[PDB]
Amino acid sequence: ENLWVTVYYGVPVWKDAETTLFCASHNVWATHCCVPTDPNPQEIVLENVTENFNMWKNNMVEQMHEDIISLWDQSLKPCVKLTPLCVTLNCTNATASNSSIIEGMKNCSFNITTELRDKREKKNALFYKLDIVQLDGNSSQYRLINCNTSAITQACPKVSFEPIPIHYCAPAGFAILKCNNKTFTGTGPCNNVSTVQCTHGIKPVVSTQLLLNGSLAEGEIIIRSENITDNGKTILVHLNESVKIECTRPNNKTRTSIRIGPGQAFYATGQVIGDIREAYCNISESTWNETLGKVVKQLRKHFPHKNITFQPSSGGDLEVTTHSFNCGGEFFYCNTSGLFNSTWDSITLPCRIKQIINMWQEVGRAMYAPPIQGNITCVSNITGLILTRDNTETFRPGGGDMRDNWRSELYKYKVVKIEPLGVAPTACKRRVV
Amino acid sequence: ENLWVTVYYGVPVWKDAETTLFCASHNVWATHCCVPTDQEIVLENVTENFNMWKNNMVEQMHEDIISLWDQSLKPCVKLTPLCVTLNCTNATASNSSIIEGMKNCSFNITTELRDKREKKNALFYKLDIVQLDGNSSQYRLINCNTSAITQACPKVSFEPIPIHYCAPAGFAILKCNNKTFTGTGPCNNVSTVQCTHGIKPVVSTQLLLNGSLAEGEIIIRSENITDNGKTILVHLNESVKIECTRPNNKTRTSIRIGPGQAFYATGQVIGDIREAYCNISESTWNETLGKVVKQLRKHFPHKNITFQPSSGGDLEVTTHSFNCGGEFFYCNTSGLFNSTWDSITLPCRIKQIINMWQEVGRAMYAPPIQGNITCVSNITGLILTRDNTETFRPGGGDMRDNWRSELYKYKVVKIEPLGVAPTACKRRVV
Amino acid sequence: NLWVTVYYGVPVWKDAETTLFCASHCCVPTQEIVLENVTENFNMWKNNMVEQMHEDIISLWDQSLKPCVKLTPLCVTLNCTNATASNSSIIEGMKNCSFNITTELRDKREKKNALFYKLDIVQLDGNSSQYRLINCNTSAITQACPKVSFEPIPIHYCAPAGFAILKCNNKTFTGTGPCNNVSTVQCTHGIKPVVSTQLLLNGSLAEGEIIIRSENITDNGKTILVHLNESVKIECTRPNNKTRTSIRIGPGQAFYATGQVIGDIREAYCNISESTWNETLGKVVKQLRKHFPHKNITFQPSSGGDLEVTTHSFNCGGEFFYCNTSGLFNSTWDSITLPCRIKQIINMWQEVGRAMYAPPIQGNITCVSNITGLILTRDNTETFRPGGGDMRDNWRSELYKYKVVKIEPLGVAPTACKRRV
Amino acid sequence: XXXXXXXXXXXXXXXXXXXXXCXXXXXXXXXXXXXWXXXXXXXXXXXXXXXXXXXXXXXXXXXXXXXXXXXXXXXXXXXXXXXXXXXXXXXXCXXXXXXXXXXXXXXWXXXXXXXXXX
Amino acid sequence: XXXXXXXXXXXXXXXXXXXXXXXXXXXXXXXXXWXXXXXXXXXXXXXXXXXXXXXXXXXXXXXXXXXXXXXXXXXXXXXXXXXXXXXXXXXXXXXXXFXXXXXXXX
Amino acid sequence: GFLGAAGSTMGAASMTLTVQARNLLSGDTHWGIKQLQARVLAVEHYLRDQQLLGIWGCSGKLICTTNVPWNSTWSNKTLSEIWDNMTWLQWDKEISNYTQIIYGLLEESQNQQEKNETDNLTCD
Amino acid sequence: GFLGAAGSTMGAASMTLTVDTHWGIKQLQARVLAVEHYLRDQQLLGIWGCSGKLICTTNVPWNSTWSNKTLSEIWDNMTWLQWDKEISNYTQIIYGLLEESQNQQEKNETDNLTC
Amino acid sequence: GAAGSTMGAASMTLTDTHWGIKQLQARVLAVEHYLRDQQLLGIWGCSGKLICTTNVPWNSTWSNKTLSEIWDNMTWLQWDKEISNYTQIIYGLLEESQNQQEKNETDNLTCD
Ligand SMILES: *[C@@H]1O[C@H](CO)[C@@H](O[C@@H]2O[C@H](CO)[C@@H](O)[C@H](O)[C@H]2NC(C)=O)[C@H](O)[C@H]1NC(C)=O
Ligand SMILES: *[C@@H]1O[C@H](CO)[C@@H](O)[C@H](O)[C@H]1NC(C)=O
Ligand SMILES: *[C@@H]1O[C@H](CO)[C@@H](O)[C@H](O)[C@H]1NC(C)=O
Numbered sequence A: 001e002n003l004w005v006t007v008y009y010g011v012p013v014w015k016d017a018e019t020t021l022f023c024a025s026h027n028v029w030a031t032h033c034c035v036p037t038d039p040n041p042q043e044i045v046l047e048n049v050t051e052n053f054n055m056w057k058n059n060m061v062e063q064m065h066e067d068i069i070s071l072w073d074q075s076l077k078p079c080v081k082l083t084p085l086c087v088t089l090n091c092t093n094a095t096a097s098n099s100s101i102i103e104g105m106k107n108c109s110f111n112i113t114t115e116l117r118d119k120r121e122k123k124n125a126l127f128y129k130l131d132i133v134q135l136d137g138n139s140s141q142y143r144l145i146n147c148n149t150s151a152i153t154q155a156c157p158k159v160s161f162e163p164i165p166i167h168y169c170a171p172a173g174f175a176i177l178k179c180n181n182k183t184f185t186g187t188g189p190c191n192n193v194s195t196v197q198c199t200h201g202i203k204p205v206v207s208t209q210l211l212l213n214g215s216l217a218e219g220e221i222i223i224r225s226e227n228i229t230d231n232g233k234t235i236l237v238h239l240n241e242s243v244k245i246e247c248t249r250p251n252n253k254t255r256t257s258i259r260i261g262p263g264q265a266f267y268a269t270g271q272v273i274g275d276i277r278e279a280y281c282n283i284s285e286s287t288w289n290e291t292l293g294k295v296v297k298q299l300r301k302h303f304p305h306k307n308i309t310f311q312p313s314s315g316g317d318l319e320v321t322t323h324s325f326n327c328g329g330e331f332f333y334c335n336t337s338g339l340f341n342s343t344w345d346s347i348t349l350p351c352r353i354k355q356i357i358n359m360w361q362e363v364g365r366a367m368y369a370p371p372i373q374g375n376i377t378c379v380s381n382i383t384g385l386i387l388t389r390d391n392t393e394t395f396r397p398g399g400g401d402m403r404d405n406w407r408s409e410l411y412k413y414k415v416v417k418i419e420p421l422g423v424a425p426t427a428c429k430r431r432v433v
Numbered sequence B: 001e002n003l004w005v006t007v008y009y010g011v012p013v014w015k016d017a018e019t020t021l022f023c024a025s026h027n028v029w030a031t032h033c034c035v036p037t038d039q040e041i042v043l044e045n046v047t048e049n050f051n052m053w054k055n056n057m058v059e060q061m062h063e064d065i066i067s068l069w070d071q072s073l074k075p076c077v078k079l080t081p082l083c084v085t086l087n088c089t090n091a092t093a094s095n096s097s098i099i100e101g102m103k104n105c106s107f108n109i110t111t112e113l114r115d116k117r118e119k120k121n122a123l124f125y126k127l128d129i130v131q132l133d134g135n136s137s138q139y140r141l142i143n144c145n146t147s148a149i150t151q152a153c154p155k156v157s158f159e160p161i162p163i164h165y166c167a168p169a170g171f172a173i174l175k176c177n178n179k180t181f182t183g184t185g186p187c188n189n190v191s192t193v194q195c196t197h198g199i200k201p202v203v204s205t206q207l208l209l210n211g212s213l214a215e216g217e218i219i220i221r222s223e224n225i226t227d228n229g230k231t232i233l234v235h236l237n238e239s240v241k242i243e244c245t246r247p248n249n250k251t252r253t254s255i256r257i258g259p260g261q262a263f264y265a266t267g268q269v270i271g272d273i274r275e276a277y278c279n280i281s282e283s284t285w286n287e288t289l290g291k292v293v294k295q296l297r298k299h300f301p302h303k304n305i306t307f308q309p310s311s312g313g314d315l316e317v318t319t320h321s322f323n324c325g326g327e328f329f330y331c332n333t334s335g336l337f338n339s340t341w342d343s344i345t346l347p348c349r350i351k352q353i354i355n356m357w358q359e360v361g362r363a364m365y366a367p368p369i370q371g372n373i374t375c376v377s378n379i380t381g382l383i384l385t386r387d388n389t390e391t392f393r394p395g396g397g398d399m400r401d402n403w404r405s406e407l408y409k410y411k412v413v414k415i416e417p418l419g420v421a422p423t424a425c426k427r428r429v430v
Numbered sequence C: 001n002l003w004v005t006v007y008y009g010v011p012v013w014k015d016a017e018t019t020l021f022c023a024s025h026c027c028v029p030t031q032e033i034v035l036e037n038v039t040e041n042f043n044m045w046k047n048n049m050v051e052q053m054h055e056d057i058i059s060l061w062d063q064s065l066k067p068c069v070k071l072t073p074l075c076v077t078l079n080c081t082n083a084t085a086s087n088s089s090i091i092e093g094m095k096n097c098s099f100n101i102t103t104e105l106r107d108k109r110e111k112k113n114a115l116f117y118k119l120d121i122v123q124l125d126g127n128s129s130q131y132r133l134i135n136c137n138t139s140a141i142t143q144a145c146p147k148v149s150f151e152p153i154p155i156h157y158c159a160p161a162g163f164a165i166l167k168c169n170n171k172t173f174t175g176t177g178p179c180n181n182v183s184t185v186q187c188t189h190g191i192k193p194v195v196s197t198q199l200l201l202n203g204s205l206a207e208g209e210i211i212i213r214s215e216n217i218t219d220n221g222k223t224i225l226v227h228l229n230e231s232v233k234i235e236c237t238r239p240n241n242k243t244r245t246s247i248r249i250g251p252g253q254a255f256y257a258t259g260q261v262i263g264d265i266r267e268a269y270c271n272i273s274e275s276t277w278n279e280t281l282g283k284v285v286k287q288l289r290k291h292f293p294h295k296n297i298t299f300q301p302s303s304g305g306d307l308e309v310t311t312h313s314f315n316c317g318g319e320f321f322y323c324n325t326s327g328l329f330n331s332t333w334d335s336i337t338l339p340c341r342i343k344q345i346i347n348m349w350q351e352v353g354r355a356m357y358a359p360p361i362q363g364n365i366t367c368v369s370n371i372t373g374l375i376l377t378r379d380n381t382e383t384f385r386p387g388g389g390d391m392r393d394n395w396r397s398e399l400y401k402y403k404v405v406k407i408e409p410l411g412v413a414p415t416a417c418k419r420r421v
Numbered sequence D: 001x002x003x004x005x006x007x008x009x010x011x012x013x014x015x016x017x018x019x020x021x022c023x024x025x026x027x028x029x030x031x032x033x034x035x036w037x038x039x040x041x042x043x044x045x046x047x048x049x050x051x052x053x054x055x056x057x058x059x060x061x062x063x064x065x066x067x068x069x070x071x072x073x074x075x076x077x078x079x080x081x082x083x084x085x086x087x088x089x090x091x092x093c094x095x096x097x098x099x100x101x102x103x104x105x106x107x108w109x110x111x112x113x114x115x116x117x118x
Numbered sequence E: 001x002x003x004x005x006x007x008x009x010x011x012x013x014x015x016x017x018x019x020x021x022x023x024x025x026x027x028x029x030x031x032x033x034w035x036x037x038x039x040x041x042x043x044x045x046x047x048x049x050x051x052x053x054x055x056x057x058x059x060x061x062x063x064x065x066x067x068x069x070x071x072x073x074x075x076x077x078x079x080x081x082x083x084x085x086x087x088x089x090x091x092x093x094x095x096x097x098f099x100x101x102x103x104x105x106x
Numbered sequence F: 001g002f003l004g005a006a007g008s009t010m011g012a013a014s015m016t017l018t019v020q021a022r023n024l025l026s027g028d029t030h031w032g033i034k035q036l037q038a039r040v041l042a043v044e045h046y047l048r049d050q051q052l053l054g055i056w057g058c059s060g061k062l063i064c065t066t067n068v069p070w071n072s073t074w075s076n077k078t079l080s081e082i083w084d085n086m087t088w089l090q091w092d093k094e095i096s097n098y099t100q101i102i103y104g105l106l107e108e109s110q111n112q113q114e115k116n117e118t119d120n121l122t123c124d
Numbered sequence G: 001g002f003l004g005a006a007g008s009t010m011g012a013a014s015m016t017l018t019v020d021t022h023w024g025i026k027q028l029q030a031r032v033l034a035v036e037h038y039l040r041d042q043q044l045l046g047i048w049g050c051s052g053k054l055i056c057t058t059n060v061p062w063n064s065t066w067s068n069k070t071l072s073e074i075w076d077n078m079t080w081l082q083w084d085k086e087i088s089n090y091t092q093i094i095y096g097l098l099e100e101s102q103n104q105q106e107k108n109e110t111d112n113l114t115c
Numbered sequence H: 001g002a003a004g005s006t007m008g009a010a011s012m013t014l015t016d017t018h019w020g021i022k023q024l025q026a027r028v029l030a031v032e033h034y035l036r037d038q039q040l041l042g043i044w045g046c047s048g049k050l051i052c053t054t055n056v057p058w059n060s061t062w063s064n065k066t067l068s069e070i071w072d073n074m075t076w077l078q079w080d081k082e083i084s085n086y087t088q089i090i091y092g093l094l095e096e097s098q099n100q101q102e103k104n105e106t107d108n109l110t111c112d
C-alpha cells in the first residue's frame, strides 16, 4: 500500500538474443581471426542459475557456417582461374608402370594457350576418372566435370586451409552462457550454467558421416536429436572415447605445371609412382565393434526394439555416400560400407581421390585441388557419428548439412543480451527538495 | 546588473541544411527500402523560403536512383562476347518477311568448351545495330564501340513503387502547402513532416507520367520564365489518359553464352505488324493545351503561342520515352505538339540497348518479353522549352526535372534546440 | 588529512597511434599553440606517421590506377626492329615493334605498330627479333588513364578528435630526443609526396645549417639523411616532340602508345650548376667530418641493381626518368650533365607483383626541381654512396618534427575539502 | 497591453494583512517584475512593495516587515497582502521591465478598492 | 534610499513647458523612474525616467538628468491634457523610492 | 566479475551494479561494416538507457526512487521476501507485464515535476 | 509537437520547450552523426552547469551590446527565429563566457581556506 | 585540444569505401573514448562536474607531499608520471564508495 517504484541500473539480467560474434585466434583462419585470444580465459559459475538451451535453434551454428563460407571464398578468390582448360581433352588409359593400367586415372592431352595470347600448345596431364566426363559417342573426347555449369578456381599453393581452433567471442553488451551437467542431451533447462566471454576453441573441421577431431563426451555416450522418435532428423552420436583412424595415400606424385597466363601456373599431376591403390583407411576392429555396441546400448534406451540394424548409406553422390577427409589438402572419399552393416586386427576402407570439388554442396562454383607431391598419411580422431533413422530399427551413416558438424561443438553455448534496467518496489518515496 | 543570460534548450528554431535522407515504404525498389513509414504539424504564423531549384533532395534522389540501378544490374550476365561481326539478313515473320524494324542476324558464338565454335541467330531491332562499312551482312551492336553491356536479370523488376524520403533524427522536412506556389520564394502555409508523401521513381522525357496533380489550377513553373533557356514544367490539375501497346506475341529463345550464363534473345514475331503505338484522346488533348496556353499567356501576354516538335540527336530527347513491363518505348509526339494558339495514334518504336541517364559506359540490355504488352499511364505534366509568336517545344531533362516537379514543395532543415536570451534572474549559488 | 579529488579537463597526454585524415581525391578543407615550459621527447624513426603515410599513399595510388584499361591483350610476340623516326638514323634505345591484336569486335585481328623503349621489353630467345613486355612474364600492367593527374599536391595531415599533433621547433633537433619550444597543431604543414631514390626533391629546407640525421650514424646498417639549408637547382628535359598513336583493345578500351619521335637525337638528360654542386657537397662534407673526424672521405656511385637503386628516379608526370648520378658522386675530400633513361613500365612503389604503364607525354618536356637533401649510406677511410629505403626516406625529413599524442583528460589529485553530503 | 486589473479589496479598519490581486495577459513568469503602489487618497502614492518573477520579494518601508509582497507565476497575478496601518490608499499594481542598468514600472493595472475605515 | 522631491509643483491651465526635480538619495542616476501620473490614467508612464522615452508618449519630454541627488523631469509644451507631475520613484533598493506628488497641470 | 550475482537474490545482486554498468562499452569492406555496425549499436543501446534515465530524472544514478506509487496489481507480493528471497531474473519474469505502463508513468511523473520547478523559478 | 508553436512569440514559445556497402556507409554515417549531435548538446549543457535543465540560469550578465532591447521588446514581442538571427554573431562569445563562469564557480568550492 | 600544459595550479583551463570505413572507425573511437570517461565519472558520482571530490581519503600517501608542494609547483604531466602506477588502485575504490553511498541513501531504516 506504501511501496514506491524504484529504478535500477546495472541489473544482472538478460534476454535471448542474436548478434554477431567476432573470431579470435598462410593459414586461413589465422589470417582472418586477427583478434588475439585471452591468455587466461575466465569463467564465472553462476550459482543457482537455470537456463533453457536449445540445439538446432541456436543461431551460432548458422553464423559459424556463413562466416566459414565467406572466408573460404575470400581466400580462394585471388587465385588462378582454370577456364582455358575446359577445351576438349584427348584421353587414354594412364600407365601403371609395369601393371600398365591405372584404374581410375586418365592420361589426357589438350591444346591450351600460354602466357602469350598468340601461343597455343599441346600439353599433357593426368586426371582422376571421377572428374572427367565424355562428350559423346564413347569417343575419347572429354570434358572437365564442372565446365558445363560453373567457374573452376585452383587453390593457391600457399594457402593450406588447415583448421586451427577458433574462438567465438561476445561483443560488449552481450555474454555467452555455457551449459554444464554433461547430460544435457539436446534441449531444455540446464542447471549449473557458467558465463564466459569466448568459446573454448573449435576447429572448423569438415567431414561427412563420421565426426572427426571434436570434443569427447565426459559422461556416457550421448545421443542427440531434435526429436529422437521422429524420422527426418539427424541423430548426432557423441562418443566419450575416440576411435583412431589412420588414412593414407600409399604412393606419391611428381607435379608439373602449365603457364596459362602471366604467371598463374596451373598445377597438374605429372606422374604417379607407388602402390596402385589410390588410398585406404585403417580402423581397429575391436575398437570399432566395442564402440558400436556401446552406441547401441544407448540407442536401446530410446529404441526398446531388439536387433537394431546398421546399414551402409542409401545413395546420392560422393558428398553424401562417402566419408570426406581433407589430409594435407588432398580430398579423400572413403567407402564406409565396411563399417556399420551389422545387427545388435583392423578394418580397411578403400578410398577414392577427387580434385574438382563443389565444396559446401554449392552449385555455382568449384575449387580445384592442386596435386600434392610426396606421400600422404594422416591420423584422425573419430569423436562421433551422424546417423539417419529408417518394421524394425534401422540406422545409416548418412550425410547431412554442414551445420550438423558444428552443432556437436556449439550445443553447449548460448548468446544472451544484457539488459541493465529494471524496476522494483521500495519502502521509500523520492524525497523532493 | 539586472539582465542576465538564460540558457534554453528545446528552442523551436532551425537552419537550412543538407543531410542524408533514408528510403522507407523481386521488385528492386523494395531493396534497402525495408524500413516502414506507418504526424503532420502545422506551423502557426511561419513564412519560409522554398526553392525547388538547387534542392538537395532532388540531387540526392538522383544519386540513389543510379546507385540502386547499378547494384541491381551488376550481378547479371555480361554480353561482352557478342561483338562478333554479325551476318544480318531480312525479317522473318508472317508471310511478308519484311518487318522494317527487325533484322535476322547470324553470328559465331563460342560455347563453354572454348573450342567448339558454332553459329546461332536471333532477331534484333534495327535501332540496336550499326553498319560497319560498305555493304550489308557486316554488322556490329551499337554498344561495342563504347562499352560492354549487361543484360538485366529476368528475376528482378524495375517497376516503380512509391517510396518515401525520411529525415534522420535532428532534422525535419518542411512542406509548402500554398496551392499556387510557383517553386521559389516565401510560402506562408508551412507544415512539418518527418517523411515525404510517396513519390514514384518513374522515368520519362517529354511528358511526365504518374505524378501528383496540382490541387489548384495548372501551374507553370520555371527558374526564370523570361529566360527561354530554362526548362518549363507544366503541372496539370487534371490527368490525361495515355494507353500504349505492342499488339504482337514475341517468342523467346535462349543462348548458352557461358558456363552458367544464359543470353536471352528474340525468336519469332507472331501477329499483326507494327512495333508500337499509343492511344491519346483528341478532345482531351486539345482542351488540355488550350488551358495550358491560357496560363502561359500570363507570362507572355499580347503575343501568340505555337507548339512545335522537338529537335535533337538521340531518341531520348526527340521522343517520349517510357518503360512498360520490360519494354523500352520511344514514341513520336509530333502529333501532340503541332498547333498555333477522336484519338491520336502516336507511332512508336522499341529499342533493347538503353544508355540510361547518358552515363555512356553503363548500359542495359532489355531481354525480350514474351507475348504482347499493353499499359495505361496518367499524364500529369509536360516539359517544355522556349525559342510575335513564341515557340514552345517538348523538352526533357537529365531526370532531375522529373523529381523537381514532385519534390518542389519540400525543404530540409536542421533543428537547433540550444540558445540564449536575457532574463531578470541571476543564478542562485547558495 | 587530505581527500581524493577528481579532474576531467586535465591537460596531459600519451604517445599514441591513430588514424589521420588528409586536408587539401582529398577534398577535405584546411593556428599553432606554443606550449611553454614543457620538453617533449621526439623520434623521427619508428614514427607511425611515416608508416601511415606509406600505407595510404600506396592505397590511393592503387585506387586511382585501378579503374582503367588493362594491357593483358598486348602480351603477344612482338616483331621488333631498329627504330628511326627522323633522318637516316637509328635512335638508340628504341625498337619499332609490330604485332597482331584482337579488335573491339572480338573476332578479327589487326596488325599494329608501336615504339617501345629497350627497357620496356625482353627477348623471348636468342638470335630472333621476338619480344614481349617485361611484365607479361608475371602479373599485369594497368594503364594509367591521363585524367588521373598524379601530381605532388601538398597534403596536410590532421589528427582526429581526441588527438593532437605536437611539433618540434628546435633547429638542431637532429632526429631524436627531448625538444623544447614544442607546440600543438591540429594539422601538419603541407607535404608534397614527391618520390625519388636519391637526391630528395622539393622538401623543406633546414632553418639552420645542414643537418645530418641518422638513427645511428655510427653504424653501417642505417641510412643517413642529409637535410640541406639551401637547395640546388636541377633542370631535366626530354628535347623531343613525341607523337602518340592509339590501339583499340576492346569495348571502349584503348592503349596509348608512342608512334613517332621527332626532335633531337640526344637522349633525355638532367643538369645542375657545377659550382653549386661542388660547394653544396663541400658543406655536407664539413658536417659529415664532424661525425667522422680525421678520416678521408670519398664519394662513389651505388653498387648496382635494377635502376631504382643506381639511378635518380625522377618523375615529370607520365615520363619516368632514371638518371645516372655517377657524375655527382665521384670525388674525394659550369654545368654537370647527367644522361637519363626513360621507361614507361614501372613497379610503382617497389612492388614486384604489380605494374603500371605510363602513356607518353606529347610534344617536348622540361621539369625544374629543388634538391633539398641526400640519402647516403656508408661503405681506415670512409666511402659514401647513394642508397635508401622504400620511400620512407621521402616522408622522413618532413614528418620528422611531428608526433601524435592522445589526450588523457582524467586524473586525480589531493585536496583540502572532503565531499560534502 | 496585458489589460492588467485588480479584482479585489475593500475598506478596512484593521491594517491586518488583507489580500488583493491584479491579473494580467502577459508572460509574467518570463522575467516580469511585480510592483505595488500605495495609491493614496491625495499625495500621489508611496511604494508599497516589489517582487521578481521568481518572488524573492521586498516590501516598501511603510509596511516593512508587516508585508507579503507575493505573486504567483502560475496565476499570472500579483496576489499580495500588507499592513502599513489602515492606509488610506486604493492599492494599485504595476509591472516593470528591465533594461540594462535601468527599469520602469510602465504597465499599470486598474487599482484595487482598498481604503481606510473607522 | 528615499527620493526627495524638488521643484515639486508645475500647475498651468494651458499647454506649457514644465519641469520637476528630485534630490534622490539613491544613486539611480537615469533610473529615477520619472513616469509621472497625468490625470487619473492609472499612473501610466510617460518616460523610462531619463534612460529612454516611453512608447506611445509625447516626444516633448527631455530633462536628460541622470545623477545622484540631481534628477529631473521636464518637457516642452504639448497638450493642455498633460498634467505631468512627474513624481520620481528612484530604483534605489527594495521597493522604488517614490517621491512626493509634485502636482502639475496643463 | 560480470553477472556473478545473477542467480543470487536481490541483496548482493542489488549491489553489484557497478559491475554490470561497466563493459557495456568495449575496450576488408565486408567485415569492416559488420564491425562498425556492432560497435555503433553497442553505443546506441548504451545511450538509449541513459536517455531513458534522463527523462525519468535518474541520470547519473545506479539506484533512483520516484513519485510513482506501486499499484499492487503489477505485483501484490510483500516487500519482505521480494528483495531478499528472489533473484532479478525471477523478478523480471514476474513483472514482465505492465513494463510499458511503468515507463509511461515514470515519464509523466517527471514531466509534472519539471513543470513545478519551471514555474517556481527560484533565483537571486 | 516538434516545432509546434515555432513562429510564435518567445514568451509563449518558452512554455513548449518540453518537446550493400554503399548503403552500409550511408546508414552508418547517419547513425554516427546523430550520436555526435546528441552528445554535443549534452556536453555544452554540462560544461556550463546546465545539465538536466530546459531552462538554466547563469552568472554571466547580459552585455547589452549583443542586443540593447529590453524585456517586453524581446519577450512577448519577438519570435525565436528572429531572436536567433538578431544575436547570432555573439553566440561564441556568450558560450565562452558561460564556460569561464562555470570554471570559476567550481574552482571556488575546492578552495583550501574555505569550502 | 588547445593544450596549455603547465603548473597544476592551472585549473581554470579545464574547458573510396575503404577510406570511408577508416574515417567511420575514427569517429566511433572518439565517441567510445568520450563515453567511457563519462561513464566512469558517472559511476563515481561526478556526473556533470569538471571538478569533484569524494569520500575517499587521500591514500597512496607514500608520495610524502602536501598541497603546497604539488599545487602551484608541479605540472600536470609531472604529476601524472609520479603516480602513474597508482591510478588503478584508486579506481575501483571510487566506484565502491559511490555505490555504497547510494545504497545507504535509499535504505529502509534511514530513507523510510
Ligand atoms: C495549410 O496546410 C494545412 C496542411 O498542413 C491545411 O490543413 C488541412 O485542411 C483540410 C481542409 O479540408 C483538412 O481536411 C485537413 O485535415 C487539414 N490537414 C491537417 C494536417 O490538419 C490548411 O487548410 C492549409 N491552409 C491554407 C490557407 O491553405
Ligand atoms: C601420357 O602420354 C605421354 C605421350 O607422349 C607419355 O609420354 C607419358 O609417359 C604418359 N603418361 C602416363 C602416366 O601414361
Ligand atoms: C587426437 O589425435 C592426437 C594425435 O597426435 C592424439 O595425441 C590425441 O590424444 C587425440 N585425441 C583424442 C580425443 O583421441
Ligand SMILES: *[C@@H]1O[C@H](CO)[C@@H](O)[C@H](O)[C@H]1NC(C)=O
Pocket: A251, A252, A273, A274, A275, A374, A375
Ligand atoms: C616419394 O618421394 C621421394 C622423394 O621425396 C622418392 O624418393 C620416393 O621414391 C617416392 N615414392 C615412391 C613410391 O616412389
Ligand SMILES: *[C@@H]1O[C@H](CO)[C@@H](O)[C@H](O)[C@H]1NC(C)=O
Pocket: B213, B239, B240, B376, B377, B378
Ligand atoms: C492513374 O491510373 C490508374 C490506372 O488504373 C487509374 O485508376 C487512376 O485513377 C489514375 N490517376 C489519375 C490522376 O488519373
Ligand SMILES: *[C@@H]1O[C@H](CO)[C@@H](O)[C@H](O)[C@H]1NC(C)=O
Pocket: B302, B303, B304, B305, B340, B341
Ligand atoms: C492569337 O492571339 C489573339 C490575341 O487576342 C487571339 O485572339 C487569337 O485567337 C490567337 N491565335 C490563335 C490561332 O489562337
Ligand SMILES: *[C@@H]1O[C@H](CO)[C@@H](O)[C@H](O)[C@H]1NC(C)=O
Pocket: B277, B278, B279, B280, B343, B344, B345, B346
Ligand atoms: C485505340 O485503341 C484501339 C484498340 O483498343 C485501336 O483499334 C485504335 O486504332 C486506337 N486508336 C488510336 C488513335 O491509336
Ligand SMILES: *[C@@H]1O[C@H](CO)[C@@H](O)[C@H](O)[C@H]1NC(C)=O
Pocket: C231, C232, C233, C234, C369, C370, C371
Ligand atoms: C625552390 O622552390 C621555389 C618554389 O617553391 C622556387 O621559386 C625556387 O627557385 C627553388 N630553388 C631551387 C634551387 O630550385
Ligand SMILES: *[C@@H]1O[C@H](CO)[C@@H](O)[C@H](O)[C@H]1NC(C)=O
Pocket: A047, A048, F004, F005, F007, F008, F009
Ligand atoms: C545459492 O543458493 C544458496 C542456498 O543456500 C546460497 O547460500 C548461495 O549464497 C546462493 N548463491 C549466490 C551466488 O548467491
Ligand SMILES: *[C@@H]1O[C@H](CO)[C@@H](O)[C@H](O)[C@H]1NC(C)=O
Pocket: F096, F097, F098
Ligand atoms: C501478461 O501475462 C500473461 C500471463 O498471465 C502472458 O502470457 C503475457 O505474455 C503477458 N503480457 C506481457 C508481458 O505483455
Ligand SMILES: *[C@@H]1O[C@H](CO)[C@@H](O)[C@H](O)[C@H]1NC(C)=O
Pocket: H059, H060, H061, H062, H063
Ligand atoms: C593504501 O591503503 C592500504 C590499506 O590497507 C595501506 O596498507 C597502504 O599503505 C596505503 N598506501 C599508502 C600509505 O601509500
